[PDB]
Structure formats: structure tokens, C-alpha cells
Amino acid sequence: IIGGRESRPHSRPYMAYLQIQSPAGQSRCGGFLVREDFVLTAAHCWGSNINVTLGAHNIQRRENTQQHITARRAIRHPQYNQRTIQNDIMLLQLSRRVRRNRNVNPVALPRAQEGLRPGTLCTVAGWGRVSMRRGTDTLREVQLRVQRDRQCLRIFGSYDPRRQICVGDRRERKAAFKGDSGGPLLCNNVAHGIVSYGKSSGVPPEVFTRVSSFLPWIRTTMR
Amino acid sequence: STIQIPYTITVNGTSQNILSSLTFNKNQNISYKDIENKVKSVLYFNRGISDIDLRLSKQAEYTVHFKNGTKRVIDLKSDLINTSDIKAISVNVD
Ligand SMILES: *[C@@H]1O[C@H](CO)[C@@H](O)[C@H](O)[C@H]1NC(C)=O
DSSP: OBSOEEOOTTSOTTEEEEEEEETTEEEEEEEEEEETTEEEEOGGGOOSSEEEEESOSBTTSOOTTOEEEEEEEEEEOTTOBTTTTBSOOEEEEESSOOOOBTTBOOOBOOOTTOOOOTTOEEEEEESOOSSSSOOOSBOEEEEEEBOOHHHHHTTOTTOOTTTEEEEOOTTSOOBOOTTOTTOEEEETTEEEEEEEEEOTTOOSOEEEEEGGGGHHHHHHHHO | OEEEEEEEEEETTBEEOOEEEEEEETTOEEEHHHHHHHHHHHHHHHHOOOHHHHHHSSOEEEEEEETTSOEEEEESOOOEEEGGGEEEEEEEEO
16 A cells, blocks of 8 residues: 555454465465455455455454455456456455454445446555555555546556546555555445556556446355 | 565556565575576466567566665566575566
């Protein structure tokens, strides 16, 4: 998270932290709980072996609120395109259901292709880098504004406003960054977006996957 | 006995917001071929790009950033290093 602040601890109890095995090394993403047995995240966070941590604030400490659960299945969208980062959405079925409590519980999803105003105020959170030189141990968050599509259309040759959201005012140094992939974009306490990609500099706008475009796939996959 | 070296990948101007690392052994002298095989490995895993795609692309390179603040840019279309000097790696394909 660039330009944000540390979250109040456990104020976002749907947040998931993902540790991913990726030859030849490791990857870290965010994600969010959408049902006691399912985490939603980005398809490019896929790996043969994924550990999920719920209930975390300081992910470098083994906190007494954390629940550690492996992913049983990691279900990418069937039309995920790695090269263009299109249809970038994945469901993790957890190997057991979370213990639901105040610090661990799911976030609501929107209704069938519910829209989102350019100018809507949304919040993104995660454990990603805060700059090109510094990271964070604790959950951070920042408020961002949905952009007109034209802003992403002219810099991202594969941005598709039917499936993706253009987020972030280019005049502000506020952005999700490396490590925040898969985390939710929350607007009015509903997860409308999934952090997906941007420029390597972290300068906005950046592209989120539009959750409402995939609701029928989400519901079929979770049943 | 190993370290994680962060890497970033940009393809056609887009970069996933993942935090991704390469595993290296501590304090080892490796060559640039050693790094390239790891770069091509994560390029294929993350963005589906292998050698054929680099030859069809316009320009392709990776940059090794070093802790002393220097960098070395290496062409993917056309010395030894100690792993503990490496700060990060960036890959760019057009
Ligand atoms: C997940 O945790 C198990 C047990 O702690 C460990 O053996 C495994 O390597 C972990 N996987 C990843 C991808 O970190």
C-alpha cells in the first residue's frame, strides 16, 4: 500500500494473507474471505502450494488471533490469460472452514453486475510494499477513487472496462502495490474489486478485477 | 543457507501487484547464465512467456540491482556476481 496508513487491528476481519510456492521461489499476495470455506483472490496468485492466514494484523508475528489453513483447491477462472492479465480471479477452497469470530469473518459481494461510479470512494488494504524501498509488517489501507475508464484505456492496452475497474487518481501517490494483489476493493462495505496490476512504479491509475462481472462464475464454483 | 531476492516483471507496460522472490544460496558466486535461467523460469510461470515470445517481442531485458546502488542491464534478445550483493531484479518485455 502506497500513501496509506496502518489499519486499526482486526478492523478488516475478511483479510487473508497468502504464502505461495512458485518455482523457483516464493510469492505473497492478499485475498479476502467470502464464505467460511472460500477466499477470493487474483488468478496470478496461483501456485501448487498455498498457505492462507486469517485473523492477522502483524503477519511477521505468530499472533494468537491468526488461523493458518492450507488451500485445498485453487480455482482460477477458466479464461484467465497470464500474458494480458485478463479474467484475473481465483477462488481458494480452504482445507477446513475458518473459526468464525469478531476477527475472522467474510465480506459481502455485490449483486449481479452492480455498477460503480467513477468518483466512488473505495478502500483497499493489504500487506504489500509501501514504496520501492520499504515494506510493512502490519496491515495498511488507503482510500482510492474509481476513475473514468479513459484513464486506463490509454495506458493499459488490455484493460477491459466490462471485466476490470480503473482505480486511482494519477495526481495522488496512493496505490495498491507489490504484495497487495488479490486484496479487496471495498466500497460501502462490499468487495467490488480485486487488486490486479499496475505500472511497476506504482504510479496510478491501476487495474482491479471487477467482481460483479464474475458473480455467476463465483456462485457456480463455490457450490 | 538461502536468501530470497525480490523480482518484478513488466510485460507490455503492465506489472502484477504480487510480491515475488527468487531463492538463492547465501554468499555464492554465480554467473549471469545462472540468473537468466531463473529469470526465464519466473517469466514463464508468471506471465506465460518463454524463449519463443522473447524472440518475437520488440525489446526484452532484465536488470540486476545491487546493494551498493549500482545496476546491470542485461539483454534477453542478444562476469560473476556474489548473491549477497544482489538487492533486487527487474524484468521488462515489450
Ligand atoms: C505451508 O506450511 C507448511 C507447514 O508449516 C509448510 O511445510 C509449507 O512449505 C508451507 N507452504 C508454503 C507455500 O509456504
